């Protein structure tokens, strides 16, 4: 039943899902920190 | 120095690198298990 309902997804328990969520949060934080400061300055100036 | 040597790579300590290696091993195992059995049977028959 698990294989049929999720042909492209394997077992996802609490530990693996929590680790994946933590990794996704870390990747999002990294991407946020990697944004060019010039775009931030332009957006902030325009909004203000 | 760390930022300049690795412009596209952030800090990679023992814990994060070990976790990334474990995740890569798990992904490789998942991909190995997800290979179609027919291709395995054909390859094994031809090799034998």
Curated annotation (Swiss-Prot), chains A, B:
Its lineage reads: Eukaryota, Metazoa, Chordata, Craniata, Vertebrata
Name the gene for this chain.
OPA1
| Subcellular localization | Mitochondrion intermembrane space
Parent-protein start and end of this portion: 577 to 624 of 960
Protein name per Swiss-Prot or TrEMBL: Dynamin-like GTPase OPA1, short form
What exactly does this protein do? Constitutes the soluble short form (S-OPA1) generated by cleavage by OMA1, which plays a central role in mitochondrial inner membrane fusion and cristae morphology. The transmembrane long form (L-OPA1) and the S-OPA1 form higher-order helical assemblies that coordinate the fusion of mitochondrial inner membranes. Inner membrane-anchored L-OPA1 molecules initiate membrane remodeling by recruiting soluble S-OPA1 to rapidly polymerize into a flexible cylindrical scaffold encaging the mitochondrial inner membrane.
């Amino acid at each position: 039943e698990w294989k049929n309902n999720y042909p492209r997804l394997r077992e996802l328990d609490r530990n693996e899902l929590f680790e994946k969520a933590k990794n996704e949060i870390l990747d999002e934080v990294i991407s946020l920190s990697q944004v060019t400061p010039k775009h931030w300055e332009e957006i902030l100036q325009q909004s203000l």
